[PDB]
Write an enzyme that holds these catalytic residues in place. Structure first.
Site, PDB file in Angstrom:
ATOM      1  N   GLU D 130       7.346  -6.027  -1.224  1.00 27.09           N
ATOM      2  CA  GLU D 130       5.992  -5.978  -0.675  1.00 27.09           C
ATOM      3  C   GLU D 130       5.089  -5.183  -1.626  1.00 27.09           C
ATOM      4  O   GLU D 130       5.574  -4.343  -2.392  1.00 27.09           O
ATOM      5  CB  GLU D 130       6.031  -5.311   0.700  1.00 27.09           C
ATOM      6  CG  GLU D 130       4.704  -5.215   1.418  1.00 27.09           C
ATOM      7  CD  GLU D 130       4.183  -6.552   1.909  1.00 27.09           C
ATOM      8  OE1 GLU D 130       4.063  -6.708   3.149  1.00 27.09           O
ATOM      9  OE2 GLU D 130       3.885  -7.434   1.065  1.00 27.09           O
ATOM     10  N   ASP D 131       3.785  -5.447  -1.580  1.00 25.77           N
ATOM     11  CA  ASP D 131       2.847  -4.792  -2.497  1.00 25.77           C
ATOM     12  C   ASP D 131       2.176  -3.557  -1.888  1.00 25.77           C
ATOM     13  O   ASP D 131       2.041  -2.524  -2.543  1.00 25.77           O
ATOM     14  CB  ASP D 131       1.800  -5.790  -3.000  1.00 25.77           C
ATOM     15  CG  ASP D 131       1.116  -6.547  -1.868  1.00 25.77           C
ATOM     16  OD1 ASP D 131       1.157  -6.073  -0.706  1.00 25.77           O
ATOM     17  OD2 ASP D 131       0.536  -7.619  -2.140  1.00 25.77           O
ATOM     18  N   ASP D 134       0.580  -0.498   5.095  1.00 24.34           N
ATOM     19  CA  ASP D 134      -0.498   0.271   5.676  1.00 24.34           C
ATOM     20  C   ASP D 134      -0.034   0.818   7.037  1.00 24.34           C
ATOM     21  O   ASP D 134       0.600   1.874   7.097  1.00 24.34           O
ATOM     22  CB  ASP D 134      -1.751  -0.609   5.774  1.00 24.34           C
ATOM     23  CG  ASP D 134      -2.963   0.136   6.317  1.00 24.34           C
ATOM     24  OD1 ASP D 134      -3.089   1.361   6.058  1.00 24.34           O
ATOM     25  OD2 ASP D 134      -3.795  -0.513   7.003  1.00 24.34           O
ATOM     26  N   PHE D 183      -9.262   2.028   1.068  1.00 21.89           N
ATOM     27  CA  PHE D 183      -9.000   0.609   0.818  1.00 21.89           C
ATOM     28  C   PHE D 183      -9.009   0.239  -0.674  1.00 21.89           C
ATOM     29  O   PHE D 183     -10.052   0.253  -1.325  1.00 21.89           O
ATOM     30  CB  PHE D 183     -10.001  -0.255   1.584  1.00 21.89           C
ATOM     31  CG  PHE D 183      -9.655  -1.719   1.592  1.00 21.89           C
ATOM     32  CD1 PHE D 183      -8.993  -2.281   2.678  1.00 21.89           C
ATOM     33  CD2 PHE D 183      -9.987  -2.533   0.514  1.00 21.89           C
ATOM     34  CE1 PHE D 183      -8.683  -3.625   2.688  1.00 21.89           C
ATOM     35  CE2 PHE D 183      -9.673  -3.882   0.522  1.00 21.89           C
ATOM     36  CZ  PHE D 183      -9.018  -4.429   1.604  1.00 21.89           C
ATOM     37  N   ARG D 196      -8.684 -10.152  -9.029  1.00 21.23           N
ATOM     38  CA  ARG D 196      -7.436 -10.712  -9.526  1.00 21.23           C
ATOM     39  C   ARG D 196      -7.265 -10.280 -10.988  1.00 21.23           C
ATOM     40  O   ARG D 196      -6.158  -9.986 -11.451  1.00 21.23           O
ATOM     41  CB  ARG D 196      -7.497 -12.235  -9.415  1.00 21.23           C
ATOM     42  CG  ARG D 196      -6.208 -12.928  -9.006  1.00 21.23           C
ATOM     43  CD  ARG D 196      -6.047 -13.005  -7.494  1.00 21.23           C
ATOM     44  NE  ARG D 196      -6.298 -14.333  -6.935  1.00 21.23           N
ATOM     45  CZ  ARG D 196      -5.955 -14.698  -5.697  1.00 21.23           C
ATOM     46  NH1 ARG D 196      -5.340 -13.842  -4.887  1.00 21.23           N
ATOM     47  NH2 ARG D 196      -6.230 -15.921  -5.255  1.00 21.23           N
TER      48      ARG D 196
HETATM   49  N1  25H Z   1      -6.047  -5.052  -0.545  1.00 18.33           N
HETATM   50  C1  25H Z   1      -5.753  -4.220   0.475  1.00 18.33           C
HETATM   51  N2  25H Z   1      -5.214  -4.739   1.603  1.00 18.33           N
HETATM   52  C2  25H Z   1      -4.913  -3.926   2.657  1.00 18.33           C
HETATM   53  C3  25H Z   1      -5.155  -2.557   2.552  1.00 18.33           C
HETATM   54  N3  25H Z   1      -4.761  -1.978   3.716  1.00 18.33           N
HETATM   55  C4  25H Z   1      -4.282  -2.962   4.527  1.00 18.33           C
HETATM   56  N4  25H Z   1      -4.378  -4.144   3.886  1.00 18.33           N
HETATM   57  C5  25H Z   1      -3.951  -5.426   4.435  1.00 18.33           C
HETATM   58  C6  25H Z   1      -2.484  -5.704   4.068  1.00 18.33           C
HETATM   59  O1  25H Z   1      -1.612  -4.612   4.414  1.00 18.33           O
HETATM   60  C7  25H Z   1      -1.295  -4.596   5.805  1.00 18.33           C
HETATM   61  C8  25H Z   1       0.208  -4.428   5.938  1.00 18.33           C
HETATM   62  P1  25H Z   1       0.552  -3.399   7.388  1.00 18.33           P
HETATM   63  O2  25H Z   1       1.079  -4.410   8.394  1.00 18.33           O
HETATM   64  O3  25H Z   1      -0.759  -2.770   7.810  1.00 18.33           O
HETATM   65  O4  25H Z   1       1.573  -2.390   6.907  1.00 18.33           O
HETATM   66  C9  25H Z   1      -5.703  -2.044   1.379  1.00 18.33           C
HETATM   67  O5  25H Z   1      -5.932  -0.752   1.292  1.00 18.33           O
HETATM   68  N5  25H Z   1      -5.997  -2.888   0.348  1.00 18.33           N
END
Ligand code: 25H
Ligand code: 25H
Ligand code: 25H
Ligand code: 25H
Lengths: 211, 214, 211, 214
Positions: D130-131, D134, D183, D196
């Site tokens: 996973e990248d 949150d 964010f 990107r």
């Molecule tokens: N680019 C970007 N995306 C974000 C960010 N925060 C949430 N997201 C949405 C995707 O992460 C949610 C996975 P979860 O189910 O909440 O552990 C962010 O700080 N940057």
């Protein structure tokens, strides 16, 4: 005027187990300060800054034996910038050899040779680290002798130390605490060349990598 | 083994096949060796170098004419191989700077400038690194100088060896690529301070030979 | 219209001992055809060619499980080109999964899903290798179904083989002889992924890396 | 270990210190993680991954939302480590594609699209990549799906774990970086198909949040 990436005295660098480090250096380092990749990125912005000022012309001056790594990387990035110019731009690499010796009392510098290719040109001095500022000051009055058009200093590293304050560098990769660092450009009696990151040498490493 | 042999037959690569700076669009004939190809071979050379000289100290001596891109690259791969050794093996990196004379009708005559304590070489394992070998006269006379300081053993490595009747027969121990008898630029080879930003080894065209001449 | 880098039938590729190859593949390969670095350079010019045509907008369509490597590399180079645009340019990555099965008689394709993001867009199909041309032909009529504005094919590899001749690709990395190749993008029952170069699998390797 | 902890204190890096595309000059606040830093950490993560899962098969499963840059990069370093093994170790690479719903007020609800033969996972060693994490709800409910196919063992690796009160407590086994509750975009994280081409992890500015919104 751009002190570069400031790494403060308080809680410096990264824990050893967070990055990849040659196993044979497991005991020879204290913390890691600047991962290689991070050096690369900063060096890139640095090359962008050099072209702003320089570019009339440019003579990049490498400091021999020691400084080859950073010079090569800095120049690779500049070449990368130069690919898109509408007219191909001439660039000259130069070389001075320079060695220092532990001093009783007074500083020792042993210089270099053949610097005809400086007259009225834009000269960049490339150094690895600035501590006392003597190397920089020496390279300075030396090139000043050959009547160049312009002179800047770029240095990957500026240590936060007591100095004569003489000529503050124009381009600075990283401003690091007063600790003894090795890796990337900096060896220690021929060791750590295979180490990509800038790290603090430990006491075990100092005694192990004799001299 | 004479390295990656690039034939007289079908030369190299058409120019539009690879990425080249717009300002040289006119200054080249063919690409012989794309940058990535140079990297891959050099990686192998470094492996070959550690096989015969590994573990021992080694002093890496760069024959420094105009640049040292190849040296820098060979040494990054060598350092990459040494990352694994149980003991860290000290590597001494040095340079021998040569200034150019009589143009190139007599390259056997070296004029060394950057020749600090040459007597460090003594009793040490020297790898001499060069970017191109043509007639072979520079190297063969450089070998005579280096051997007088009696090292424990000398090996030579050259990115490119040109296949020429003008060759005096000297063969390096390590050859990146054996290439046709044509004048090349790029990667490590500049032309009057030009093609520094050219990543690939390409044959210099005649309109480029003239636009960039001293 | 650009057959790409043509590697002929006569005396193909390079001797094994000229490049660096994982030791555990010492017996599993015959020759090496396209060193990794060489793939990279061609892929770069390829990305330059894609922007010429494409760029209205662009949807790069990856073929899933298998094709991720080349897609990633091709896209990295395109991103690299896109950094200098004066307006930031939107780019959409898409994904179809696609699996093939050895055929008695007739071809088997198992497709993909969720391709709403294609309507009136410029779509690039990315493939790894073209042999029979069935994968390409399948991906084609599939995207044609979703009313795109434009459709091109890019493929790292075109094999020199008997085909129905249906739709000749627009961008071709390399045109290679009729030999079975592995490495870089192409595995063999999960092996050779760690192999960076495109090489001919040997008979020892075929029997060793079962299925 | 919670990875490279980036503090709430002094955030990250001033924008002029690193190289960033001119078209985003206005769309960011700070750089948290320069590209090269991401590479260096990822190299270490890969080493850590082989320590606990090495030798055995392993199925590398990419949680695929918008891109898979991180996955691609983790897997290049892992492949680089496997280059040395006496036996070549087969590596199975797979993807699990998730489409986004209710925006992000309830991320625990997964809608899997690219879910081919999920029963391959059974009796196999799965590394889930996973990248960003949150609130942790996506992963924790993805874990419930994956475990029902009874693998031999599941580990999770995330480039970025956000330090948020909105976290439900799920911690990955491998963390690249633990970051402030802001964010971020860049490297692997796009914003409505933008950034990107941004190499670094940077905080999205409000003028950028608005210029690029859906
Ligand atoms: N680019 C970007 N995306 C974000 C960010 N925060 C949430 N997201 C949405 C995707 O992460 C949610 C996975 P979860 O189910 O909440 O552990 C962010 O700080 N940057
Ligand atoms: N490796 C290593 N060397 C160091 C370090 N500090 C000083 N030196 C010695 C060489 O630098 C001298 C620069 P100067 O002429 O004093 O301005 C160090 O932190 N690491
Ligand atoms: N760039 C470039 N330089 C060349 C070329 N050929 C010779 N030179 C000059 C340097 O090589 C001479 C060494 P030698 O003593 O002849 O073995 C060339 O094809 N490209
Ligand atoms: N690894 C590997 N696979 C190969 C090779 N040739 C075919 N294949 C099978 C997958 O390619 C099918 C493309 P198609 O749909 O037939 O146009 C090969 O030389 N190496």
């Amino acid at each position: 005027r751009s002190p570069g990436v400031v790494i403060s005295d308080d809680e410096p660098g990264y824990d050893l187990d967070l990055f990849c480090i040659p196993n044979h250096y497991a005991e020879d380092l204290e913390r890691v300060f600047i991962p290689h990749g991070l050096i690369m990125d900063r060096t890139e912005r640095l090359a962008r800054d050099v072209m702003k000022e320089m570019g009339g012309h440019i003579v990049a001056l490498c400091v021999l034996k020691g400084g080859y790594k950073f010079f090569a990387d800095l120049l690779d990035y500049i070449k990368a910038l130069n690919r898109n110019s509408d007219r191909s731009i001439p660039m000259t690499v130069d070389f001075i050899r320079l060695k220092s010796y532990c001093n009783q009392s007074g500083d020792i510098k042993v210089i270099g040779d053949d610097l005809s290719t400086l007259t009225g040109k834009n000269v960049l001095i490339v150094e690895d680290i600035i501590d006392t500022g003597k190397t920089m000051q020496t390279l300075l009055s030396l090139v000043r002798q050959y009547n160049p058009k312009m002179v800047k200093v770029a240095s990957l590293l500026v240590k936060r130390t007591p100095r004569s304050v003489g000529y503050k560098p124009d381009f600075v990769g990283f401003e690091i605490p007063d600790k003894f660092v090795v890796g990337y450009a900096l060896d220690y009696n021929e060791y750590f060349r295979d180490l990509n990151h800038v790290c603090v040498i430990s006491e075990t490493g100092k005694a192990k990598y004799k001299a």
